[PDB]
C-alpha cells in the first residue's frame, strides 16, 4: 500500500519540475493506469491555467464544474487517459486528449457532435450468468455486444448520452492505427502484416504516409478507422509523422526571425 | 472389469481425477483408438502430443499429457545426465560467459531436476526440450515436453 507519489517517480509526460515540493498527486484506481494518464488537478492547473495553486483547483472541481464523459467529478485526483472527452460548460471549451508526435500528451478542441462520441478497444471477451456475453476494455465493461459480435483487439464506437453505436472496425490489413506505449507512440500508420508467435509477444509491421515504415507489438495497436478519410474523430496538427532531428532543428531556426 | 497389478502397487487406488472410470456403458467417444476410457490433453505452444500418451496404460497426475498441469512460460533445452529416481530425471546444461576486461570466453554449467513422464524413457546424453510449470516438488519447476 502506497498513498504518496513523488516528483522523481512520476512520469515526464506530466512535465512537473524537480524543485517546488517533493510530492506529486497519486491518482486513484480508475479507468486507466498510473504509468500513463493525466490526473485532473495536473490538467487544470499546469495546462489550462484556471488554477495557480492547489486550493484554486479543488475550489473549481468540488462544485461539479468539470465533467469527463458526461458525469461531473468532485474529486481532486482521478485519472483521465487516452481517448476520453473533457467538457467544462462554463468556458465553452471541450477537449479530447490524445497522444501526439514526440510521445507526449496533447489536447484537441471539438464541437457538438464529437463531444458525445468516443472509441473503445476490446481487451477480453467472456461469458457471464444466463449465457450473456460481456466485453471489457480500458474504461468499464458495458454489456453484450452486437454491433456484429466478433472478436478481440477490435475497436468500437461508443456514444455517451445514450448508446447509439455506429458500427465498429476490426484489425485487418489496409486499415489505420494510432499507437500507445513502446516509445513509438504519437504516430499513425497503416497495417501491413501481423506476425503471430504462439505463447509469446505478437509483433506487427506497419507503414505510414510517404514511407519510412516501422514496427511495434500488437497490444500497442489501437485501431482508428478503415482509412484516413473514414476516421470518426479529429486529430492534431501533425498527422503522426516523425521527421528527422536535423529537419526539425533547421526549421525552428529559420522561422524564429519574426 | 478387474484390476491391474502392474498399475497398482500402492496402498491407495491409482486413477485419473478427470474422467469417470466407473463409467460405464460408455458415452463417447473419448477414448483412444478404442479401449477403456481415458483422459488425454492437447497442449499447445506448437508441441504435438506423443502417440503413446493418448493410448497409454499409465496413471500420472504430473504430466501435462493426462493431467491439469499447464506449461506456460520459459522453454529450455539441455541434455540428460542421470536416470535415477522415479519419474525424476536430471538435466545438465552448458553455455559460455564473457568477461569484458579480458575479451575472452569461459565455460560454465548449471543443472536442473525436472519431471519425466513414464511415457518417455530418454537415455543419458539425449537432448530434450522442457517447459515451465508450478512447483511439483521442492526442486522441481519444469516438466518434459519433447525428447530428441
Amino acid at each position: 500500500t502506497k498513498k504518496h507519489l513523488k516528483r522523481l517517480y512520476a512520469p515526464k509526460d506530466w512535465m512537473l519540475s524537480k524543485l517546488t515540493g517533493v510530492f506529486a498527486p497519486r491518482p486513484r484506481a480508475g479507468p486507466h493506469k498510473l504509468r500513463e494518464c493525466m490526473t485532473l488537478m495536473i490538467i487544470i492547473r499546469n495546462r489550462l491555467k484556471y488554477a495557480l495553486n492547489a486550493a484554486e483547483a479543488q475550489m473549481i472541481l468540488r462544485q461539479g464544474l468539470v465533467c469527463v464523459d458526461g458525469k461531473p467529478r468532485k474529486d481532486t485526483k482521478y485519472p483521465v487517459g487516452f481517448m476520453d472527452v473533457v467538457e467544462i460548460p462554463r468556458t465553452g471549451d471541450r477537449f479530447r486528449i490524445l497522444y501526439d508526435v514526440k510521445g507526449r500528451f496533447a489536447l484537441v478542441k471539438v464541437g457538438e457532435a464529437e463531444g458525445n462520441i468516443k472509441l473503445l478497444k476490446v481487451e477480453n471477451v467472456y461469458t457471464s450468468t444466463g449465457r450473456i456475453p460481456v466485453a471489457m476494455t480500458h474504461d468499464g465493461h458495458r454489456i453484450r455486444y452486437p454491433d456484429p459480435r466478433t472478436h478481440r483487439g477490435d475497436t468500437l464506437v461508443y456514444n455517451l448520452k445514450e448508446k447509439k453505436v455506429v458500427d465498429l472496425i476490426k484489425s485487418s490489413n489496409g486499415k489505420v492505427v494510432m499507437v500507445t506505449g513502446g516509445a513509438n507512440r504519437g504516430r499513425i500508420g497503416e497495417i501491413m502484416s501481423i506476425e503471430r508467435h504462439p505463447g509469446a509477444f505478437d509483433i506487427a509491421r506497419l507503414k505510414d504516409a510517404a514511407g519510412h515504415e516501422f514496427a511495434t507489438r500488437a497490444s500497442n495497436i489501437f485501431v482508428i478507422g478503415k482509412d484516413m478519410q473514414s476516421v470518426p474523430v479529429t486529430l492534431p496538427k501533425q498527422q503522426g509523422l516523425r521527421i528527422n532531428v536535423i529537419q526539425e532543428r533547421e526549421e525552428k531556426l529559420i522561422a524564429a526571425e519574426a | 472389469h478387474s484390476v491391474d497389478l502392474t498399475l497398482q502397487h500402492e496402498k491407495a487406488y491409482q486413477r485419473q481425477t478427470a474422467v469417470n472410470e466407473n463409467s460405464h456403458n460408455p458415452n463417447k467417444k473419448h477414448v483412444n483408438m478404442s479401449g477403456h476410457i481415458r483422459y488425454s490433453k492437447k497442449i499447445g505452444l506448437g508441441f504435438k502430443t506423443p502417440k503413446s500418451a493418448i493410448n497409454g496404460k499409465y496413471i500420472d497426475r504430473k504430466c501435462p499429457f493426462t493431467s491439469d498441469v499447464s506449461i506456460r512460460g520459459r522453454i529450455l533445452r539441455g541434455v540428460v545426465h542421470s536416470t535415477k529416481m522415479k519419474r525424476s530425471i536430471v538435466i545438465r546444461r552448458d553455455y559460455l560467459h564473457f568477461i569484458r576486461k579480458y575479451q575472452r570466453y569461459q565455460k560454465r554449467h548449471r543443472s536442473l531436476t525436472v519431471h519425466c513422464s513414464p511415457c518417455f524413457d530418454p537415455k543419458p546424453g539425449d537432448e530434450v526440450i522442457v517447459g515451465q510449470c508450478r512447483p511439483l516438488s521442492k526442486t522441481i519447476r519444469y516438466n518434459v515436453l519433447e525428447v530428441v
Binding site: 444466463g130 450473456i132 454489456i143 453484450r144 452486437p146 456484429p148 | -
Partner: protein
C-alpha cells in the same frame, strides 16, 4: 393508538436566563413516517422492477438478431445448393428424353 399524532403530545421543558426570555426545549421525533416518507419508499420498488424489465428487453433483441443471421445463412446456402444441383440435373435428364 393509531391515527393520533404524537407531535402534539411531546414533553416540553423550559429554561430561564435572567432578562433574556425563556425557550421551550422539546425533542425531534425519529422513526416517524409522514406523507413524504411513504411516497419515497414506494417509489424505490417502481425503479427496481423497471430496471429488470429493461435487461430482459435487451436480451430479447440480442437473441432475435442472432437468429435472423442464422436464418439468412440457411436461405443463402439453399439458393447455392438448389441452383447447382437442379441446373446440372436439368441439362442431364431433359436431353436424354430429347434424345
Amino acid at each position: 393508538s393509531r391515527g393520533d399524532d404524537v407531535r402534539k403530545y411531546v414533553i416540553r421543558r423550559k429554561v430561564v436566563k435572567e432578562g433574556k426570555k425563556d425557550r421551550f426545549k422539546a425533542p425531534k421525533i425519529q422513526r416517524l413516517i409522514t406523507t413524504a416518507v411513504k411516497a419515497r419508499r414506494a417509489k424505490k420498488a417502481k425503479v427496481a422492477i423497471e430496471k429488470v424489465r429493461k435487461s430482459a428487453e435487451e436480451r430479447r433483441a440480442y437473441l432475435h438478431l442472432i437468429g435472423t443471421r442464422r436464418r439468412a445463412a440457411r436461405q443463402r446456402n439453399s439458393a447455392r445448393r438448389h441452383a447447382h444441383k437442379v441446373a446440372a440435373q436439368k441439362q442431364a435428364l431433359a436431353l436424354f428424353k430429347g434424345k
